[PDB]
C-alpha cells in the first residue's frame, strides 16, 4: 500500500492536535506551537473511486491508530481506533477506516465511505473535537487542506 | 488473556535511583497506551502519566513533569516508570494500566510497592 | 483541569441493600466518566466506562448514569464481594484526575 505523510488544516486554517489518547482537537496555532499538531499517514485504499473521490485510510503516523467511524449511541461518530501493527496499514482496509477523499474548489472533504453524505468535521469554536458531521456548509466545518510532510 | 504483570517490591534509600516495569501479554503492546498511577497508603489514586509504546509519545501530569521518566521497550512488551534521585515521599504502590478508546483504563498491573526509607 | 468530588466518603449499608454514589466534575468536559472498583489490598479494576456501560464481566447489578457534571453509580442490591472503595475518573484534555473515593462498609 502507499502512503503519504501530511497535515490537515481546516477552512479556517485551525490545526489538529492530539487531545487525549484517542481524540483529536482543532484549534489555531501558529509558530512554535505549531510543531503540537498531528501528523497523519494517509494510505492510498481499496474502494469504489471516482475522478474526484479517492478512498483513503487516516493514520497517525508512527502509531497503530487510525481514524474509523462507528455507530456510537446509534449515531455515526469519529473515533481514533488501536490496531495490530503487524497487519496495518494494508491495501484492503476495512470499511469503517475509509474515507472520499473529494476535491472541492481548491479544499478537500473527508466523506465517511461507511455512512454516506457524513464529513470529517470542526466546530468554529477553538479547542472543540474534531468529529463526524452529517452537514456540509452549516456552521460546522468541513473543508481542509493538506500539507505535506517529510518522508 | 489480556493482563500486565509488574516487577516486585522494592526497598530502596533516599538518593538511589530506581526503575520499576510493567509487562504486556495476550494482547498488541504496541497498540494502546500505557498509563502510571500512584497510590501512596491509605491515599487515593494519583495519575502521573502516559506513553504510546509505538512511537514513545510520553506525557506526564504536572506534578510528576521532571521528577520522573517514562519510558517503553515494545520488543519485549514492557514500559518502565524511573527516578533517578527517590525520596521518602515516593513510598506508594505504583500501578500501570492500559488506556482504551473508551476513556478508561481496562486493564490493571498487580501495582509494585516501592518502600523509600533510610 | 478538573476536579471530581465524589461522596459520601464513607457509604455504610448491609448486603441485600441499594447503594448510591455520586461523583461531580468541576467542569463540564467531552471525554467519558469511568468508575474504579478497588477491593481490600487489590489492584484497582474498571466497572464502568461511558458513564452506564459495564466493563467485561461486571455484573448486572451494577448501573451507572448520569450527564454534564453530575454522575452516579448504583448496585441494586449488594453482595459480599461489593465492600471496597470505589473512584470515577474523567480526562481533561491530558490530564487524568480522579475522585477521592467512597468506601462502601458493612453496616451490622
Known amino acids: 500500500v502507499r502512503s503519504l505523510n501530511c497535515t490537515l488544516r481546516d477552512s479556517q486554517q485551525k490545526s489538529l492536535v492530539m487531545s487525549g489518547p484517542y481524540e483529536l482537537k482543532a484549534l489555531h496555532l501558529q509558530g512554535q506551537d505549531m510543531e503540537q499538531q498531528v501528523v497523519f499517514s494517509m494510505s492510498f485504499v481499496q474502494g469504489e473511486e471516482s475522478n474526484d473521490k479517492i478512498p483513503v485510510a487516516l493514520g497517525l503516523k508512527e502509531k497503530n491508530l487510525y481514524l474509523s467511524c462507528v455507530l456510537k449511541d446509534d449515531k455515526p461518530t469519529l473515533q481514533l481506533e488501536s490496531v495490530d501493527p503487524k497487519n496495518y496499514p494494508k491495501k484492503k482496509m476495512e470499511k469503517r477506516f475509509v474515507f472520499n477523499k473529494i476535491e472541492i474548489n481548491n479544499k478537500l472533504e473527508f466523506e465517511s465511505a461507511q455512512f454516506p453524505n457524513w464529513y470529517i468535521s470542526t466546530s468554529q469554536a477553538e479547542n472543540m473535537p474534531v468529529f463526524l458531521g452529517g452537514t456540509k456548509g452549516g456552521q460546522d466545518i468541513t473543508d481542509f487542506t493538506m500539507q505535506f510532510v517529510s518522508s | 488473556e489480556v493482563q500486565l504483570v509488574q516487577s516486585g517490591a522494592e526497598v530502596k534509600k533516599p538518593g538511589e535511583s530506581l526503575k520499576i516495569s510493567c509487562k504486556g501479554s495476550?494482547?498488541?503492546?504496541?497498540?494502546?497506551?500505557i498509563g502510571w498511577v500512584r497510590q501512596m497508603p491509605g491515599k487515593g489514586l494519583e495519575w502521573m502519566g502516559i506513553?504510546?509504546?509505538?512511537?514513545?509519545?510520553?506525557r506526564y501530569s504536572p506534578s510528576f513533569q521532571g521528577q520522573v521518566t517514562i519510558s517503553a521497550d515494545k520488543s519485549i512488551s514492557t514500559a518502565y516508570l524511573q527516578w533517578s534521585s527517590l525520596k521518602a515521599s515516593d513510598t506508594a504502590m505504583y500501578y500501570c494500566?492500559?488506556?482504551?478508546?473508551?476513556?478508561?483504563?481496562?486493564?490493571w498491573g498487580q501495582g509494585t510497592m516501592v518502600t523509600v526509607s533510610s | 483541569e478538573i476536579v471530581l468530588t465524589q461522596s459520601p466518603a464513607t457509604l455504610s449499608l448491609s448486603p441485600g441493600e441499594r447503594a448510591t454514589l455520586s461523583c461531580r466534575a468541576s467542569?463540564?468536559?467531552?471525554?467519558?466518566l469511568a468508575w474504579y472498583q478497588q477491593k481490600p489490598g487489590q489492584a484497582p479494576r474498571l466497572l464502568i466506562y461511558?458513564?452506564?456501560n459495564r466493563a467485561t464481566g461486571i455484573p448486572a447489578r451494577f448501573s451507572g448514569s448520569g450527564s454534564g457534571t453530575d454522575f452516579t453509580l448504583t448496585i441494586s442490591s449488594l453482595e459480599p464481594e461489593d465492600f471496597a472503595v470505589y473512584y470515577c475518573?474523567?480526562?481533561?484534555?491530558?490530564?487524568?484526575?480522579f475522585g477521592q473515593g467512597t468506601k462502601l462498609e458493612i453496616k451490622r
Open positions: 467542569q463540564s468536559v467531552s471525554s467519558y
Open positions: 475518573q474523567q480526562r481533561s484534555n491530558w490530564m487524568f484526575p
Open positions: 506513553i504510546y509504546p509505538s512511537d514513545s509519545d510520553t
Open positions: 494500566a492500559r488506556y482504551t478508546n473508551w476513556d478508561a483504563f481496562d486493564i
Open positions: 495476550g494482547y498488541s503492546f504496541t497498540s494502546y497506551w
Open positions: 461511558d458513564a452506564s
